[PDB]
Amino acid sequence: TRRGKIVCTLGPATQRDDLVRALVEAGMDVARMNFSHGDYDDHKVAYERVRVASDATGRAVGVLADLQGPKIRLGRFASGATHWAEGETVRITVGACEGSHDRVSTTYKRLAQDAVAGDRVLVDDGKVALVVDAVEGDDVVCTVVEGGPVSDNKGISLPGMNVTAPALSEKDIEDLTFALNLGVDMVALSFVRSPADVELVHEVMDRIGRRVPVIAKLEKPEAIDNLEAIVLAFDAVMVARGDLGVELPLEEVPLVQKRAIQMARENAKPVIVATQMLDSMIENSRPTRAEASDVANAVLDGADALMLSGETSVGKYPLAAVRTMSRIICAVEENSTAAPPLTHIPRTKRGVISYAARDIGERLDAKALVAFTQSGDTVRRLARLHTPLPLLAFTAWPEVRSQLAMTWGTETFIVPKMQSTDGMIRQVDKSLLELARYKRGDLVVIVAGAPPGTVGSTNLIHVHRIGEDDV
Amino acid sequence: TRRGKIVCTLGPATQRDDLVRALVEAGMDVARMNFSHGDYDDHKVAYERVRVASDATGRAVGVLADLQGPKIRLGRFASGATHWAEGETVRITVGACEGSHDRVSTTYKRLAQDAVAGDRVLVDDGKVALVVDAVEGDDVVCTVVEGGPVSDNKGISLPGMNVTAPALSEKDIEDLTFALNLGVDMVALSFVRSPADVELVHEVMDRIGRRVPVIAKLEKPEAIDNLEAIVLAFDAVMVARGDLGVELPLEEVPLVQKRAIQMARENAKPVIVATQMLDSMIENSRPTRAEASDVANAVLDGADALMLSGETSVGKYPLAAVRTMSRIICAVEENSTAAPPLTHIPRTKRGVISYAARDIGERLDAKALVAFTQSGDTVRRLARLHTPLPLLAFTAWPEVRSQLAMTWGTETFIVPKMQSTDGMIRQVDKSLLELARYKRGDLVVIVAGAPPGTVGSTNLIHVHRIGEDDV
Amino acid sequence: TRRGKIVCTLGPATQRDDLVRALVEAGMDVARMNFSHGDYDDHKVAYERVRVASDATGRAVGVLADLQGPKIRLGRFASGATHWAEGETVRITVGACEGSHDRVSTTYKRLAQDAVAGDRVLVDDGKVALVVDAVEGDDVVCTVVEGGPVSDNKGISLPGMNVTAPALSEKDIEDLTFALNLGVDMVALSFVRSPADVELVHEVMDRIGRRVPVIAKLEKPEAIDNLEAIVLAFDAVMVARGDLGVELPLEEVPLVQKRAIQMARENAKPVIVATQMLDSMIENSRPTRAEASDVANAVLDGADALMLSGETSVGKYPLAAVRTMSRIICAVEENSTAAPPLTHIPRTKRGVISYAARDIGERLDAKALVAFTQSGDTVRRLARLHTPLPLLAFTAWPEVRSQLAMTWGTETFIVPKMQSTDGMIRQVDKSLLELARYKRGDLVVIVAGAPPGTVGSTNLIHVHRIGEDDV
Amino acid sequence: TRRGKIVCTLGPATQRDDLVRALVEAGMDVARMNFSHGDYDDHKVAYERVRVASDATGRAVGVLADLQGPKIRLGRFASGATHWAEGETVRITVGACEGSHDRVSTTYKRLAQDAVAGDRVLVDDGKVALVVDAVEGDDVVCTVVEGGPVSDNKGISLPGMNVTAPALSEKDIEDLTFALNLGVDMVALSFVRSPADVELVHEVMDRIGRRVPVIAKLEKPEAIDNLEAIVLAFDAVMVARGDLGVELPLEEVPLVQKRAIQMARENAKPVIVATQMLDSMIENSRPTRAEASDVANAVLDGADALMLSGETSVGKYPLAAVRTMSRIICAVEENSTAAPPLTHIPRTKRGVISYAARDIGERLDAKALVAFTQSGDTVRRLARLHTPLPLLAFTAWPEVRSQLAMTWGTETFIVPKMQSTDGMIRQVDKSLLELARYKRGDLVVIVAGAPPGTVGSTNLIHVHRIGEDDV
Ligand SMILES: O=P(O)(O)OC[C@H]1O[C@H](O)[C@H](O)[C@@H](O)[C@@H]1O
Ligand SMILES: O=P(O)(O)OC[C@H]1O[C@H](O)[C@H](O)[C@@H](O)[C@@H]1O
Ligand SMILES: O=P(O)(O)OC[C@H]1O[C@H](O)[C@H](O)[C@@H](O)[C@@H]1O
Numbered sequence A, B, C, D: 001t002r003r004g005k006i007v008c009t010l011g012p013a014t015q016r017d018d019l020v021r022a023l024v025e026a027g028m029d030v031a032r033m034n035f036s037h038g039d040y041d042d043h044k045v046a047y048e049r050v051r052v053a054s055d056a057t058g059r060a061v062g063v064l065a066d067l068q069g070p071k072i073r074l075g076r077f078a079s080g081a082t083h084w085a086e087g088e089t090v091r092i093t094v095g096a097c098e099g100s101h102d103r104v105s106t107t108y109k110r111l112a113q114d115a116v117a118g119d120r121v122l123v124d125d126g127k128v129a130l131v132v133d134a135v136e137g138d139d140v141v142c143t144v145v146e147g148g149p150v151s152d153n154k155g156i157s158l159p160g161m162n163v164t165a166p167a168l169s170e171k172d173i174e175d176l177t178f179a180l181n182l183g184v185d186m187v188a189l190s191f192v193r194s195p196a197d198v199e200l201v202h203e204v205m206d207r208i209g210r211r212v213p214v215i216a217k218l219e220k221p222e223a224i225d226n227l228e229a230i231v232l233a234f235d236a237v238m239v240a241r242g243d244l245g246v247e248l249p250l251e252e253v254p255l256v257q258k259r260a261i262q263m264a265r266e267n268a269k270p271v272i273v274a275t276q277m278l279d280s281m282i283e284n285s286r287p288t289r290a291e292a293s294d295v296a297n298a299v300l301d302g303a304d305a306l307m308l309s310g311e312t313s314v315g316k317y318p319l320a321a322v323r324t325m326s327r328i329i330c331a332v333e334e335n336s337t338a339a340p341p342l343t344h345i346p347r348t349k350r351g352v353i354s355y356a357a358r359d360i361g362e363r364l365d366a367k368a369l370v371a372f373t374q375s376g377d378t379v380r381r382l383a384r385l386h387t388p389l390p391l392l393a394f395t396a397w398p399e400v401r402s403q404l405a406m407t408w409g410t411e412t413f414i415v416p417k418m419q420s421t422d423g424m425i426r427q428v429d430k431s432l433l434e435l436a437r438y439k440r441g442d443l444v445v446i447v448a449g450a451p452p453g454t455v456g457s458t459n460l461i462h463v464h465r466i467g468e469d470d471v
């Protein structure tokens, strides 16, 4: 079975009866609640359905709060959706209006102040493209240079305009709050520009007194210019290709992705690859040949996780999207799970020991690798190496099981806290023995530390056969 | 400028006035005439427009005749197109009929004889799926299991159904004939299953007395089971992913592609990657992020050429499709033109010498590599190595220039036959100096052979400064 | 300090007061008692002197019993020594007689039976050479082809001709017995030809009820034809270059040595390089430039140990020979202790774990590597890798400390039997702390096993700071 | 045949009739005339005998003038020799006197000016050692700390103290002159310290109007501190281990040798390894096991040439020494001629092309590699790579044939000045065909350049079959 993790975005297509369950049953490892859309009641109900289904199935499922960030949007159209055709003129305004095909509203209120003639406006990541002709008072007059349908509150991107808006708005702060108290496992911040942007998120966490993993969404050129520092300051990164493809040249993204996945793995942080991986599959029962290739290539690049956005949130074949994504990942991994090697020899205690542990296990044809961890960090330095062996994490903190649902090839087991390393070995033996694929005499390699209960204290590898007294 | 070659399929969207010109000006290296559709007048006019534009611009543009092969398809619907929706029952028949939504005709006349209940029927390379319920006489009664639009005469695929039809039908033979006498540079055979299938093509060529390079289209499991032998028996291969993705599990294709590109490069044969690379761009002015990834990955896999099918033949932005494909290729190549290395050290005189020539040029920071070739084989063994240096082919046979338009990173120059290697050197200097981007004193490495005008006789490398007396 | 081990042969030059002491104080790691010369009281007293000085200094010193083997020699001359000069006729006979210049006897009693005209006889490991002319009944009539003095009972070599003789003679059996009861740590067998020859040695040990490590001396073509099998059947090997250089062409020896060192290291068996390493130091206070090179090259080849024969047994500067040998070894090792890598990845539990432990220690800037062993196998699989870190063996069996004095770069510490991982680790802390050299808080890697007190139980690595609570 | 070159030193043992002949017939590639000993008539007659035997046999034999340098010495003793035994006092003085047991003179006239107490004095490259006690006026008062005999004019070494003495002495200048006019091919300078020391030598050559190759003898710590610069300023280097082993710690030499050979190979300059390689053979018909190892190791280190000093100049088996050295070299080379790879990719035109030529030849199983060279630079960049293919140099300047007799694995052929590429290739065919072992159809790779007759013209490779039309 599968090593690569699957992240699904929830929405209207996942609201019908026990559909969230079906996704979890079909392979969903992380559930993304997008806070760009929806109402607090909708999120809460979604989050409950995940917890029920996770707990009802036995399958770890993390819950990811995606914060809108400084996203610029359109208002509502009187029609709710119109068609903007090439050759037509449209006025985007800062001013409150009844929204229509010829004049529509936007959230960025500095638009007229900051937009100059020539500037480009991309809608829905390139579905329509406009160029600014002039600024007539509080409107921006643009001529449509690529025609298509636009709908209420759709995202617009103004490449090259210095956009001034806070890392976290009040909507963002108030959604962070609601999501932290709801119990989510992780949080993603949109439109990250600096390594210090996490500090603001952290602050709110400290006010509320509850911190979680913060994922950086890489969708700005500034992000890519400070990639290493962002990967060290944040806990994870998402290659957010949609906005990244209109903020950068869309032809540059394939290489940015590859360079960003490598960077995460180097520093042992999870990486998600997102947006239009199976875009075709919103309307079609099978994907394109390019889409299948895009997924297989995200695997061979070394992605911890791949994500589906519209394909599950509003799509018509949300199960087939998750199912197919898994078949492809599995198809690639059957051939080889080997990933692009690291460019350095590990230097941290935990990194070095997890490296050695991988060596021993693979060379002895061990049945599984087992790692004990408080923060998940030990387990992530082994995950990044992409072993074909089952990697099994053992931890006392249940939240870590949900946090490790987006870390590559890792299955977690929650256990009572131990105060002796032999205790730990017995625990492993107990848990493993209840599993179909495990038996007595079977060989496993266990990574551990002492004194137990201490993060980073990992310092021990043990080659153990299930049930024997080799301790 | 670009090294990766772009192959476009011509059709109705290229028959608007001076459109073929625009494509060649925009980057088309090979023009694919698909013999599935169109009539001889349509093809002939297209082929002329390519020769005019090639000759008018100076840009080499090869002409590829794609033979339909044993393709199975539907008839014409009375309304021209219908929608087959999930749940509906449809009868495909051997019998001639008036065609409709409830009963349509097919070309494979053994369908009722060879199709059993359970078997699946995919339409349009996967977009509509049926399963066979029963055989009533000369009908096949199916239930539509995935619903969508079907149009007149569309292709159907009966996976893992032993289909008996000749490698080349009479239509195919008569299209080979028409295309050989029209002057085309290469020929592609569809649905290749054996290495001996080229023999049949060759035979007809010998009857008609004009041989060209034969490309194998890899879209059958048999093809992939005999991949090495097919790549040695044919002159080129195309990874024909549409049919390949319904004849094999669509998740297996990404790896077959990569394995097939490696195999072509090993044996120094051109390889084309085809079908849905930028599928989205038929209707949209920009592609998806998966499509862009699919193209970048075909480059990094090592493809000589990438192809557009519907994106130029019936699409709405055929110019933008070609332009975009080139921007991506170029984006990847600016970073690095490195391909996955060969798995062997060359053994053949031509291979070894072209390898050494690459070495010398790169190590001396040469301005260009120059190779002389009768058949193009010397030039292809250097192309496969993917050098960042300009590779420039010199040949006396003009058809080779068009044959090398689908070989990676190669530019050709036609020259008069010389009878001394001395005279070859001066020829190179003459031609190169008429370029804007060359100067006297520039350093160049020249591969050649003596006695001249003999195939495979390549046996000399010369390190030469433009204009100077080092000969 | 030094990592490469030094083996000295004891003899007349080491019998003056506290000279054995001086050698041990000057670096002798193994003492070789050669049973070809000297008598049991000479050996006994030498053995007493080694154990006194070993015990008095704290330096481990192994004791090696070298058995003469099937050595062929001459009988005794009336004058005790004659001079054979070129051109003369000499008759070596199977008959009984007390020698003279013209006719002398030999111990190989099949000389006349097995020698043909054309064969060669070399005396004193080469410097006096005869060629066989005829066999007249009992005598072998030869011509002296390179003249010089022959003495009583001098060793003669019948290169190329097949000698039939038992692996162990009765003298060898009786010296095995005397040396086993005297309490020697290892035994070397001379002129080994087969992997089955250790069986014979083993048998006698089983009769006598005491087994020790058996070293194979490689000085026969048959030995090198069965090199791998001999290295797997024996516990160690010695490249015995003296006889090897007359039994094989002396020009073949350099490469056999290198190939034999590689073979030992691969299968984790100690290897000694012997004979004339510093030959000129018998007369001279300094060696030649070739001798110095030969020693440095035995180091770089990967030898566990280098040996001195005449340089200490009968030489004039026995102390200086040992001191010089150590300066050179040390000079090479300061530069780099890197040895030619293994041609395989370790496959055995103990091999795999000791490799990983080396990795971790070196990556984490550890102060020492510590390994627990019953027989020494675990410790030798790490020694063979040649680490620059201190390798420290911990064992309850004191004889193993003397056995590991010929294994590369290993210092051994004897401890009481421990019944706990805890116990083991605390013992390490105690021992290491009691050196000036170690401090509390220092970082070390410990290899061990459980259940304790079992050979090959090895299954754990522990990263431990001296004195801390991390167990 | 052999690829490694053998250099022999001539002297008293080579002054018999047809003794010089015997060496050339046995394998001598370079003849070394040592200008420390003997007089101009002795040298002349030696030089005549080399040129006769070279010319009479067809074997290239270079002639090397070794200049004494600023060698420091003792004066003459009244009795011609005395014996200094440990415990004695001796006074070495900068005063004039005829020596005796207790007070002898030296040639370095600054001994008293800059000897300090504590300094050491080795006599006869180490066998007699003294320690400096004081300076009384102009005598240097020492204690004999290792006893032995000293004779007239014996060399003394002042390790550690800075000697000020000119790069070339006046004896050296007038021996340079005598040797240049005698017609020697190369010159070696002793006790080189600086890259500017060759300027001195060059200057004198320019006065006298004849330059030859100048070899640096590496026997000083200053030399090794400036090793790279000396190898770039000089044309060759000799690792002069005798004096190097008393001027540096004798244990440091084996690694300096290896480091110096690598440095020569990298910059494509010949390197000789000298002194005591088979020292034992002066008195013995066979060498030691260490000596044989030292020779094999000089081969595997990558030496162009190995040298014999006393073994041929004053030894009793000069012929056997040369023969033995060759058997061992040959034994190593039969196995593998592989040398430690360069630490850089060639970037000079002639380096790069000679590299490629090696590639082509080996990949095509060519019979030989053929290189045209004016000075030998091109030929030496291929020699340094150690190919198993025959390397054959073609040159018009006959002196270069003798200069290339110390370059690895190279055989030279003298040809006329040509002005034609065709000419050159036919010349190769002519010359090669006169060897039995080359025939028509045989494949050879030829390196050359145009315009002919220019050093560094090199710019072409040609793959040619003997006698065929591939020109
Ligand atoms: O080299 P490693 O041990 O694998 O650690 C890689 C790097 O990224 C980690 O995630 C840590 O934040 C860094 O301190 C570390 O240098
Ligand atoms: O790798 P090389 O030695 O250059 O040759 C490449 C290989 O494929 C080519 O296309 C030839 O058909 C083969 O005979 C050849 O072995
Ligand atoms: O696999 P390793 O740990 O490197 O051990 C290599 C070899 O060592 C010893 O000689 C064992 O007897 C062998 O069975 C083993 O194959």
Ligand SMILES: O=P(O)(O)OC[C@H]1O[C@H](O)[C@H](O)[C@@H](O)[C@@H]1O
Pocket (backbone or CB within 6 Å): D232, D266, D267, D268, D269, D345, D346, D347, D348, D349, D350, D351, D352, D381
């Ligand atoms: O690049 P290569 O031909 O190997 O040369 C590398 C170096 O060695 C040569 O001997 C030259 O003295 C240097 O100028 C040169 O840079």
Ligand SMILES: O=C([O-])C(=O)[O-]
Pocket (backbone or CB within 6 Å): A219, A240, A241, A242, A243, A244, A274, A275, A309
């Ligand atoms: O906001 C998004 O959907 C993204 O860019 O991933």
Ligand SMILES: O=C([O-])C(=O)[O-]
Pocket (backbone or CB within 6 Å): B190, B219, B240, B241, B242, B243, B274, B275, B309
């Ligand atoms: O025939 C086709 O169009 C194909 O296979 O891609």
Ligand SMILES: O=C([O-])C(=O)[O-]
Pocket (backbone or CB within 6 Å): C217, C219, C239, C240, C241, C242, C243, C244, C274, C275
């Ligand atoms: O006895 C030995 O060791 C030898 O022959 O070298």
Ligand SMILES: O=C([O-])C(=O)[O-]
Pocket (backbone or CB within 6 Å): D217, D219, D239, D240, D241, D242, D243, D244, D274, D275
């Ligand atoms: O004279 C020499 O060459 C030396 O000192 O080695």
Ligand SMILES: [Mg+2]
Pocket (backbone or CB within 6 Å): A190, A219, A240, A242, A243
């Ligand atoms: Mg976004």
Ligand SMILES: [Mg+2]
Pocket (backbone or CB within 6 Å): B190, B219, B240, B242, B243
């Ligand atoms: Mg097809």
Ligand SMILES: [Mg+2]
Pocket (backbone or CB within 6 Å): C190, C219, C240, C242, C243
């Ligand atoms: Mg022996």
Ligand SMILES: [Mg+2]
Pocket (backbone or CB within 6 Å): D190, D219, D240, D242, D243, D244
């Ligand atoms: Mg010297």
